[PDB]
Amino acid sequence: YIRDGQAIYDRSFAIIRAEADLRHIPADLEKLAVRVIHACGMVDVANDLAFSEGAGKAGRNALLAGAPILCDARMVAEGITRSRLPADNRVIYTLSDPSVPELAKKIGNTRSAAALDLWLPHIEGSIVAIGNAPTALFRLFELLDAGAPKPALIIGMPVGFVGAAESKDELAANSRGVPYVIVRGRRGGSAMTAAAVNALASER
Amino acid sequence: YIRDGQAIYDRSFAIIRAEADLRHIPADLEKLAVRVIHACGMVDVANDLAFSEGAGKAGRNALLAGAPILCDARMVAEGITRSRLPADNRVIYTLSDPSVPELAKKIGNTRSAAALDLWLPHIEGSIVAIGNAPTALFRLFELLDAGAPKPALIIGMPVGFVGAAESKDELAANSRGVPYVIVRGRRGGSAMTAAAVNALAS
Numbered sequence A: 001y002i003r004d005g006q007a008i009y010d011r012s013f014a015i016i017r018a019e020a021d022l023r024h025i026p027a028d029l030e031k032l033a034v035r036v037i038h039a040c041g042m043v044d045v046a047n048d049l050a051f052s053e054g055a056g057k058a059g060r061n062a063l064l065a066g067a068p069i070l071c072d073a074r075m076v077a078e079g080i081t082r083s084r085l086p087a088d089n090r091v092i093y094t095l096s097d098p099s100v101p102e103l104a105k106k107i108g109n110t111r112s113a114a115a116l117d118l119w120l121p122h123i124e125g126s127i128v129a130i131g132n133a134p135t136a137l138f139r140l141f142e143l144l145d146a147g148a149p150k151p152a153l154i155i156g157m158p159v160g161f162v163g164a165a166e167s168k169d170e171l172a173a174n175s176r177g178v179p180y181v182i183v184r185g186r187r188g189g190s191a192m193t194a195a196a197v198n199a200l201a202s203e204r
Numbered sequence B: 001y002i003r004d005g006q007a008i009y010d011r012s013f014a015i016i017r018a019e020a021d022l023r024h025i026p027a028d029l030e031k032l033a034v035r036v037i038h039a040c041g042m043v044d045v046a047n048d049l050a051f052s053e054g055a056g057k058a059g060r061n062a063l064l065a066g067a068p069i070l071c072d073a074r075m076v077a078e079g080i081t082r083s084r085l086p087a088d089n090r091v092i093y094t095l096s097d098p099s100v101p102e103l104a105k106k107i108g109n110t111r112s113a114a115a116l117d118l119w120l121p122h123i124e125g126s127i128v129a130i131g132n133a134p135t136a137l138f139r140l141f142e143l144l145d146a147g148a149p150k151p152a153l154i155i156g157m158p159v160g161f162v163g164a165a166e167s168k169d170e171l172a173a174n175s176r177g178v179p180y181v182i183v184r185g186r187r188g189g190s191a192m193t194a195a196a197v198n199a200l201a202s
Helices: A005-019 A027-040 A043-048 A055-064 A074-078 A100-107 A111-119 A134-145 A164-173 A190-201 B005-019 B027-040 B043-048 B055-064 B074-079 B100-107 B111-122 B134-145 B164-173 B190-201
Strands: A049-051 A069-071 A127-130 A153-156 A180-183 B049-051 B069-071 B127-130 B153-156 B180-183
Touching (some): A043 A049, A055 A153, A164 A180, B027 B043, B027 B055, B043 B049, B069 B074, B127 B134, B153 B190
């Protein structure tokens, strides 16, 4: 077997490019697509990628500008490669704030959803990275409808069986004037979500 | 949309059980299968589950008995829910040891693989959780063949396009006397692996 970490790295990306149908992926999203596929082992995930026009450059440009990355889940945050960040970009995660549980109760939502209230000082021009909680995406919709400042990009890749597919479809159908990238259906998660951020963070 | 955490949690598992064909999944492994599905959102991942008979019981009992869990990747290690652990089980992750880059050059492997040398004092009766690096799994075979103490269970779920599929198939074909659970193919990753451990812990 290949015992060289760099060799292994380089090879997988090649094999992905050889095998994946990337015809409908614009240039500004080609690295993102390859990287998300890399994360999950499924070339057919590209079939399920959906996005706004220029969503890739929206994200790349924002990160260059020093935009923060707001993360719905600890594992998303943890998965972002700090060394790849072009501008000392803050990775923000609020779910573990002590005020969150009481919030959740008062606003009648999940803890994941309630945490977004703490994003507000940071949300303008941000990268929103949602890998785990449909209810965070759903809430976000409410905050935007209500006049919240707009992120530069929303990465909506929550995984699972309750609300996940639905939340992503809604984002695509009405993204409130915000650039978006999703993986349609039940697939997604922290690794794929981190991968997307990582792709847009560096030229590689 | 559903606004209650517990309800969301409960509902997903209900759907999974409803949709998944877990007929050929033994009792001792059902929760693991269901939790791996939950982690990845693919009912058909059950299609690719492989194991040694009784692997689920092997793992559960080890953890009950205070076995450590040895992880190839940071995210696998972080993915483990400590509160679920039944016996103050240690989660061992050695990749960040300062000695590792030198060890890698010295054995002429990857860093993820070199880190395994560090596992040796802890490997006996352990839960091995490999979720990222197939070179780790490959290296593990070398260590076993050289007569390392045997884990209680190897969970082999590395992801990717280079060696992942091969490394997992080798484990199934020759686990060196050690119980195993794998996800065949290119699929896997930290979330699935952590899910497997979490299932067995509680």
